[PDB]
Amino acid sequence: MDDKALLVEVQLLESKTYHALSNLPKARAALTSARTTANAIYCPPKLQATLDMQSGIIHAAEEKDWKTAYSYFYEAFEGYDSIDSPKAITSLKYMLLCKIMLNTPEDVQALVSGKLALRYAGRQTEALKCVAQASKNRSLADFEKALTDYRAELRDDP
Amino acid sequence: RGYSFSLTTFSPSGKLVQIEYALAAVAGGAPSVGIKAANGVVLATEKKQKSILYDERSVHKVEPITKHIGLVYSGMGPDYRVLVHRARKLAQQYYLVYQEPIPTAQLVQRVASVMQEYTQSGGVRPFGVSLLICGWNEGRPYLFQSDPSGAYFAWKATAMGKNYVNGKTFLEKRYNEDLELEDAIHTAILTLKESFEGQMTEDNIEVGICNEAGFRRLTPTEVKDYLAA
Amino acid sequence: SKMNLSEEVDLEDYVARPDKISGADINSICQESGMLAVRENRYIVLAKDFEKAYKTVIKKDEQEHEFYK
Amino acid sequence: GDLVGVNKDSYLILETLPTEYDSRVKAMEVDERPTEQYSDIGGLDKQIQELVEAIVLPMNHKEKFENLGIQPPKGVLMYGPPGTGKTLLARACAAQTKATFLKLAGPQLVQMFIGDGAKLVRDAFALAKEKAPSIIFIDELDAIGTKRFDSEKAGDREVQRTMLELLNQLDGFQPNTQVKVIAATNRVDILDPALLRSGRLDRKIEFPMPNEEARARIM
Amino acid sequence: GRIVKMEVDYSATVDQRLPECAKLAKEGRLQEVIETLLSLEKQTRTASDMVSTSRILVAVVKMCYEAKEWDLLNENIMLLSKRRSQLKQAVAKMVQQCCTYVEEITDLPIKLRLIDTLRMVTEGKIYVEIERARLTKTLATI
Amino acid sequence: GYDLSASTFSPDGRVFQVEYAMKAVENSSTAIGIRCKDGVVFGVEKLVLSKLYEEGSNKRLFNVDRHVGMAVAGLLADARSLADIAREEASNFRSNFGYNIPLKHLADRVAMYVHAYTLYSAVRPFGCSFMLGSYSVNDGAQLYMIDPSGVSYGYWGCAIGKARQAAKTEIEKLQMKEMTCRDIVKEVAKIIYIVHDEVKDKAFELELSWVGELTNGRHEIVPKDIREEAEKYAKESLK
Amino acid sequence: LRPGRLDRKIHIDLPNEQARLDILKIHAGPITKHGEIDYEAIVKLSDGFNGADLRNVCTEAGMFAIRADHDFVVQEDFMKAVRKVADSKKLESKLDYKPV
Amino acid sequence: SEQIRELREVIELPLTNPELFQRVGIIPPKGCLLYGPPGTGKTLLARAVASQLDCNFLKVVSSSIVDKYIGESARLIREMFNYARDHQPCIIFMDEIDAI
Amino acid sequence: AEVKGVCTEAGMYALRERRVHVTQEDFEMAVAKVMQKDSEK
Amino acid sequence: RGSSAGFDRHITIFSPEGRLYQVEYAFKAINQGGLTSVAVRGKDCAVIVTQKKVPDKLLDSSTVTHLFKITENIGCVMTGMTADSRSQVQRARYEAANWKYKYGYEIPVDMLCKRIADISQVYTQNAEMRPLGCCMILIGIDEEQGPQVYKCDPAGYYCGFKATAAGVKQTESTSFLEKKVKKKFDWTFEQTVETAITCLSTVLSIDFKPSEIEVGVVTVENPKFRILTEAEIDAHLVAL
Amino acid sequence: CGKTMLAKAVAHHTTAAFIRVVGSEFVQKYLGEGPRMVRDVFRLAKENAPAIIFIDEIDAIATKRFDAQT
Amino acid sequence: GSSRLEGGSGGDSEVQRTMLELLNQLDGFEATKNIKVIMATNRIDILDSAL
Ligand SMILES: Nc1ncnc2c1ncn2[C@@H]1O[C@H](COP(=O)(O)OP(=O)(O)OP(=O)(O)O)[C@@H](O)[C@H]1O
Ligand SMILES: Nc1ncnc2c1ncn2[C@@H]1O[C@H](COP(=O)(O)OP(=O)(O)OP(=O)(O)O)[C@@H](O)[C@H]1O
Ligand SMILES: Nc1ncnc2c1ncn2[C@@H]1O[C@H](COP(=O)(O)OP(=O)(O)O)[C@@H](O)[C@H]1O
Ligand SMILES: [Mg+2]
C-alpha cells in the first residue's frame, strides 16, 4: 500500500542495522532507498531530522568527504532542536567532531558558545571541547588526557 | 400555478447543462467516504461547523432509513433532507406491500427514479446532492452511489465532495478485498484526514456502520476511540 | 523574536484558523498588536492584545453560506 | 508656475503674461445673453422660484445670508422626463442675471488623452473664479457622471477621473463660495452616488410633466 | 488629557468623606470603611477625575496600613489596579505611598506581600507612571 | 432586467415589483385617518377631475363591515377588490365563530391576502394602500394600515397618498390621545385643506366617515351638517 | 491595500444616534435662532443622513426662514427642512462598498 | 472621536515620541486609508490634521497628478516622495485614489 | 518535459552535495521530486 | 468565480459553478429591515432580544413588534421582510396546531424548524415562487433536552445553536457570542438576558433604553413563553 | 507573500554588485531615451562581471497588449 | 485544460481562427505553392466543426 511514511522509518532501521554488522556497501543501498521514499512526504517533521542524521553517519563512515557530513548534521540539529532532547545532543557531538576532522578546530568554540547551543551545554559538549582545544594546541599529550578524563564519550560511542 | 416546462434541456453538443452544474455543486460539498468491508459497510463525513456556537448534535448527516439501511450525502443539506424523507416513505410502502425490509438495491432504484423525475419535470431543478447508500441484505454488505442524474453505481469504496479524485486515488492504493469492519473504519477516517485542513475531533466528523446487527450511527465516544490512531 | 512578548501569550492559538493571511497581515498583526501596548503605556504585549489585533487585521469575510454543504 | 515671456536669444524674463486658459474653456462663456424671460416658462412656478432663490438671490443679497449666518446652498440639480423645461430655466436664468454664465456641456469634458478632461474642468472653474460672480451650467451630466464601476478585464476610468476632478473641485480641500453650479439631467438613476451629496449639488429639483393647466399656459 | 467643562468640583464631596471613614475604621469597622470607598471612586472614575481618583485611591491604601490588615491590604491592592483602567497616573500615586510601606516595615510578610506589588505593576499598567517605582521595588527584593 | 416579475430578487435583495406598486399609490390623492378616545375618523381628498361627475361618485370610503371602515389610496379597482375580500373575510368570521371580527384579525387576514400576491409571476402586487378603522367597547378604538407589501401596523394617525409626509407632520401637532371625534372631524378637515395643493389640483370635495361611541359602534358617513361645519372651519383656518 | 503599504484602514461611517446630535450643533450653532430649538427632534427623523444633509438641514432651514423675510429661525423651520432633505435622499443608491 | 484617535496614532505619535515604539520593537505603520459612505467626514478629517500639526503636509487631488505626456505622470510621483524624503516629518495626503 | 526534468534536476541534486559526477541516486531522487512528489495537483 | 449562463440570476436554477443566486439574494434581503436579533441559551433559560425602532410617534408601540408566540411553549423572533415573516409565523402556528391534533403532544422546536425548512426548500427548488426573505429563531424547553434554540434560513438550513443572531450585525454579534461562549459557558443563569443585551449594545453601540428593545424568555421553571414588559427590561438594564 | 524581501536579503549577503531598477523608471518623456537607459544597465552590469540586476514591477514594461498609435 | 472549463466570457480561440483565414487562402487563391501550415493542440475533440 502507498504508505511511505512508515516505509522510510523501517527502511532507516534496516540502514542502521547493516551499519551495526559493518557492511557499508549494503548500508548505503538501504539509506538511498529510504531517501527516495522520503522524498514523497510534504511534512515528515522528525523522520527528516532522523533521516539526515543517518545519512551523515554513512558519509562519515565511508570517509569520503567530511565537509558534506557537517552539512547533513546541521540539518539534524535544526530539526532536532527544542523538540527532542534525548537524541538532539547526539547531533552536537557529531557536529563538533565533524569540524575537528576538517583541520579547523577553531570553529568548535563558536558552535558551543553560540546562543542557539548554550541551551544544550553538558558533559558531551565539554567532551569534544577538550579534544577541540587539544587540536588547536597541537599537543598529543593534551589529547590523551582529554580522552581518558572524558573517556565516557570518546571510546564508547560506536 | 406551476411551470409545466422542463428547465433542463439538451445543449447543442448533447450534454444536460443543469445536471453538470448540479454535479459541480456536489463537488463543492463536504467530503464523504464509504468503504465496503467483508462483514459490513462504513460511511464517514466531516462536520466542521462555522463556529463553536453551532450545536454539533442538533442535526445529523448520517441518517438511518430503515433498520438495515443508512445513507450519507455531499451537497445541499435541505435537498438531502427531502431525499431522506422520500426514501423513508418508499421503504415503508415496500414493507407494507411485501412485509419484508426493502433491499438496498431496490431502495437505490426507487430513490434514483425519484431523482430522475426532477431532471425532466416542469419548473424544477436537479437535486444538488449525491447519496451513498449502505445496507446488509441477503447476508452480504451493499454500498451504492446515486448522482443527481439518477444513475446509481455499485462501489467497493468511493469518496465524494471536495478532493474526491485524490480520495479515490487513495482508496485505490489502500483498499483490500478481505478487510474487516474495524480496518475499514480506520481506512475511511484516514481518507477523510487526507483533505481536512484542521484538527479532527469527535465532533468534527461523523461515522456510520452497517453489519449483521443492522445500521447505527456511531456515538462520539466510539468515534473518539477510533480516532486515537 | 524581536518583540517583547509575555509568557501567557500562546502563538499556537493564533496560527490555527482557516484564514489565509500571507505575509503582511502577519506583520500587521504583530505591528498592531504591539501598537495596542503603547495605548496604555505598556512595554509587553499580552494575549489580550493579540486577540484585539487579529479581529482588526484579518477581517474574515462572510464567505460561507453553510446551506451549500 | 507663472507664465513669463523670455527673450528669444538671451533668455531673460521681460513681462508677466496674464494666465492662460484652454481655447475650449473660453468658448463656453456666453457673450450674447439669451432672451427668454421668466414669463416664457409655464407650470414650473414652484421650481423657478426655488432656483432663483438658490442661484440668483444669494448673489445679489449677500447682506441677508450673512445677517443670519447660513452658508448659501451649493448647486442645483434639475432632473425630469425628457422634455419638461430643464434647459429653458437655465437659458432663462442666463438672461435675468448680470453675471458670467459659463456654459458647459455633457460630452465635451471627455477627451482622449489622459488628463485632458481634468484640464477642462479645473480651467472651467478657475475662469469663473477669475471673473465676477459666475454660474457654471453643466448640461447632460450623464456623460461625465455615470456611476462608478468595479471590474477586471477592461473598463472605463478615463471618464471617471474627469468626474473625480469635478467632485473635488466643487467641494474638496477648498471652500469655494462664489461659483454656482447648475446641472441638468434626465436620468438620475445612473448618476454616481458621490455626485448627489449635500456638499455637491444640493437643491435637487424635480421637474414633472404638465398636469392639466401647465398644458394650457404652455400652449 | 481630555479637558471636561468645569461644572462641579468633586474634591469637596470627598473632603468631608475621607476623614469620616477614618473614624469608622478606628473603632474596628474595617470592612465598612473599605466597601464604601470603592463605590465612591467608581463615580469619580466615570467622571475621570485625576485629583479626585488619586486622593481617594491612596486613602484605602493608607487606611489599611494603620488597620494592620495585611491580608486585606494585598487583596485590596489588586482590586484597585484592574477595575476600569483606573486613571493612569492614579495608580502611579498609589504605588508610591505603598512603596514607602515596604521600605519601613520589617518582619517576614513584607516579602510575602512585596511580590504582590511587583505583580500589580509587573509589566502591565506600567511606564512613566509606575515604571521607576518597580525598579527600586525589585532592588528591595535584591 | 430584474424588475419584470415579483418572483425575482434584485441582487441587493429587493422585490422591485412591490416598490413599483408602492409608487403607484404615492401618485394618488391623500387620505388620512386619526384615532381618538371615542373612535376613529377618516378623510379623503377627492379630486373632481371634471364637473360632469356626480358628487359622491368614485367614493373612496367603504364599509367592509358594520363596525369596520375603509379608506383607500391608489388604483381604485384593486381597492374595491380588496374591499370585497375584506367583506368576505368578515362575513365568514361571523358565520364560523359567531361574533364580530376583531380589527387586528381582519387586518392580518387582508394583509396576508395581499402578501400572497407578492410571491408568484402569475399575479401582480396590488396597487393600493388602505386603512381600516373600528370601535368596540371591549376592544376600543383601533386603526390599521396595509401596504402593497402586505405590512400591517397599528397607527394613532396615518396618511396614504401623495401628501403623506405633510399630513403626518400636521397630524403630529394634534395630541389626539385626549380628544373626541367631534374635534377630530374639524381637525381632519383642516389637515386635508392644508395638504391640498390648489396649483396642481383644480378642485376637490371632502369625504368624511367615522366610527365610535357617538355612532354606537357603527361605521357611517358623517352627517352633512357636521361636514359643512368642518369645511367652514377649514376655510376659516386658511385665512 | 496590502498591509505594509496601507496598514490601518479607518472606516468613517454614517453618524450614529449620539453622533448625529453632535453634528447638528456645530453647523447649527452660528444661526440667529429664537426659541427652544430642539436638536433631539431632528435626530430621530434623520436616519442615514451622512454628514452634509445634516448640515444641509441647517442651511435648508435658513432657506425656509429667509422666505417670509425672517431674520428669525424657529424649530418648525428646522423640522420643515429635515423632511425636505430626506425626500431628496431617496434618489441616492445606499450601498456600503467596503474593501476586501 | 474614536476615528481621530486611531488616525492620530499613525501620524502624530510616531513623529513625536519614537522612543516608545523602540521599546516594544514594532515599526509604526506607514499608510492610512479613510474610506466610507460618500458624505461622511473624510476630507474634513484630513483637513483637520492639515490645519494642526507642525510637519510638512502635502495635499494632492490624486487626479491632478496625471497628464497626457509619456512620463510626466510618473515623474510627479517620484518628486512627490523625493520632496517628502528631503523634507522630513512629512505627510502625503493623496485624495480620492480611485483615479490613480 | 517530466523526462527532461529528471536529467536536469539530477544534475542539481549532484550540486547540493558538491560533487562532480552524476550518480544513480541523483536520477532516482530526481523522479521522486518531479513525478512522485509533484503527482498531486 | 461568478459565472452566469441564462436565467441563473432570475430563477432558482444552478449557476455554472453550482450556486443558487436567488437564494443568496434572498439572504441579502433579510438585512433590508435594518433590525438585528440576538438569541442566547443558558443552563435553564433561553432568551431573545431584538431591536424595536418606532420611527414616528404616530405608530402604536404595541403593534410594532417582532416577537411572536407559535404555541404556549414556543416563541420566535423574525428578521427580514415583515409580510414574509408574518406569513411564516402563521404557517408555523398552523403546523404546530396540526401536529398537536394528529400526534397528541406538543411540537418539539426541532420538528417545527425542520418543517419550516422543508417548506423553504420547496420554495427554493421550484421556479414559480421566490424564497421568503425572512429568518426565524425559535426557543423552547424540551422534556429531555433542556432549552433549545433553532434558526431556519430561506435556503432551508435549520442547525441548532447555543447563541445566534440574525440581521445587519449578525457577524459582529456572532463573534461577540463566540468569545463569551468560549469564555466560561455563554451565560449560565437567568441573567443570561444580561449577556444578550450587552452583546446588542456592543454591536449597535446604543446603550438602550427600556422602550428600545424587546425580550422574550422561556425558563424551565415557567416554560410558558413570555414577553418582558418595559419595567422588567428597565430593571435588567439598570442592573447592567 | 515576501518577494521583494528575499531580494532585499540577497542584496545584503551578496559578494557581487547589485543593480536596482524600477519598471516604471525605464519610460521617460524624452523619446528614444528609454532604450538607451535599459541598455546602460546591462552594459554597466558587465563591467563589474559578478553582478545581479533587479527589475522590479516588470508589469509596467512587459505587457502583451500594445496599441501602436498613442 | 484547467481554466475556462465552464461558461462565461472566453469563446473561440485566436490560434484556431488563424488557419480558417490562412487555410482558406492556401486552398485556391494563392500563387506560390510552397507555404504550409501546422497546429499543435492538446485536444482534437474541441476543434471547430470547420477544421
Ligand atoms: N463630523 C462632522 N462634523 C462636521 N461636519 C461634518 C462632519 N461629517 C461630515 N461633515 C460635513 O461633510 C462635508 C463634506 O465632508 P467631506 O468632503 O470631508 O466628505 P466626503 O464626501 O466623504 O469626502 P471626499 O469625497 O473628499 O472623500 C463638510 O462640509 C462637513 O460640513
Ligand atoms: N516570512 C516573512 N517573514 C518576515 N516578514 C515577512 C514575511 N513574509 C512577508 N513579510 C513582510 O512582508 C512585507 C512586504 O514584503 P516585501 O517588501 O518583500 O514585498 P512583497 O510581498 O514582495 O510585495 P509585492 O508582491 O506587492 O511586490 C515586509 O515588510 C515583511 O516584513
Ligand atoms: N413650461 C414650458 N413652457 C414653454 N415651453 C416649454 C415648457 N417646458 C418645455 N418647453 C419647451 O421645451 C423646449 C426645451 O426642452 P428642455 O426641457 O430643455 O429639454 P431637456 O429637458 O431635455 O433639457 C423648449 O423649446 C420649450 O419651448
Ligand atoms: Mg467623500
PDB file of C-alpha atoms in Angstrom, chain A residues 4 28 32-33 35-41 59 65 68 71-72, chain I residues 13 16-18 24-26 28-33 36-38:
ATOM      1  CA  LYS A   4       5.558   5.674   2.569  1.00  0.00           C
ATOM      2  CA  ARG A  28      24.353   2.614   1.541  1.00  0.00           C
ATOM      3  CA  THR A  32      19.427   5.531  -0.609  1.00  0.00           C
ATOM      4  CA  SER A  33      16.078   3.756  -0.886  1.00  0.00           C
ATOM      5  CA  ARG A  35      15.934   8.852   0.854  1.00  0.00           C
ATOM      6  CA  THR A  36      13.984   8.237  -2.354  1.00  0.00           C
ATOM      7  CA  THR A  37      10.824   7.225  -0.495  1.00  0.00           C
ATOM      8  CA  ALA A  38      11.264  10.066   1.996  1.00  0.00           C
ATOM      9  CA  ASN A  39      11.020  12.499  -0.930  1.00  0.00           C
ATOM     10  CA  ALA A  40       7.256  11.914  -1.216  1.00  0.00           C
ATOM     11  CA  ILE A  41       6.065  13.341   2.132  1.00  0.00           C
ATOM     12  CA  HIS A  59      29.039   9.690   4.752  1.00  0.00           C
ATOM     13  CA  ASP A  65      34.106  13.934   2.388  1.00  0.00           C
ATOM     14  CA  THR A  68      29.347  17.147   3.395  1.00  0.00           C
ATOM     15  CA  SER A  71      26.009  19.882   6.206  1.00  0.00           C
ATOM     16  CA  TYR A  72      23.890  16.811   6.942  1.00  0.00           C
TER      17      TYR A  72
ATOM     18  CA  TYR I  13      20.961  17.141  -6.906  1.00  0.00           C
ATOM     19  CA  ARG I  16      23.850  20.237  -3.430  1.00  0.00           C
ATOM     20  CA  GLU I  17      26.381  17.577  -2.408  1.00  0.00           C
ATOM     21  CA  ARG I  18      29.209  19.464  -4.166  1.00  0.00           C
ATOM     22  CA  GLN I  24      22.424   6.672  -9.962  1.00  0.00           C
ATOM     23  CA  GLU I  25      20.926   8.031  -6.744  1.00  0.00           C
ATOM     24  CA  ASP I  26      20.655  11.517  -8.229  1.00  0.00           C
ATOM     25  CA  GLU I  28      16.389   8.155  -8.820  1.00  0.00           C
ATOM     26  CA  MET I  29      15.945  11.018  -6.359  1.00  0.00           C
ATOM     27  CA  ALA I  30      15.031  13.273  -9.283  1.00  0.00           C
ATOM     28  CA  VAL I  31      11.984  11.248 -10.329  1.00  0.00           C
ATOM     29  CA  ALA I  32      10.795  11.486  -6.731  1.00  0.00           C
ATOM     30  CA  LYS I  33      10.590  15.276  -6.954  1.00  0.00           C
ATOM     31  CA  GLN I  36       6.425  11.333  -7.159  1.00  0.00           C
ATOM     32  CA  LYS I  37       6.335  14.478  -5.014  1.00  0.00           C
ATOM     33  CA  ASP I  38       4.615  16.537  -7.733  1.00  0.00           C
TER      34      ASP I  38
END
